[PDB]
Amino acid sequence: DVPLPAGWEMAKTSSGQRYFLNHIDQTTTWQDPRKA
């Protein structure tokens, strides 16, 4: 759960957009949760 948040979602687009969901808040975070 450290290398990838567990209450967390991955939406990786081959177009070059790594945007992630927070399944807890229903919020979309572009920011790496491990950086802060």
Partner: peptide, 9 residues
């Protein structure tokens, strides 16, 4: 587990 749409599409 779920696919939304890019917030900056």
């Amino acid at each position: 587990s779920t696919y939304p749409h890019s917030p900056t599409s």
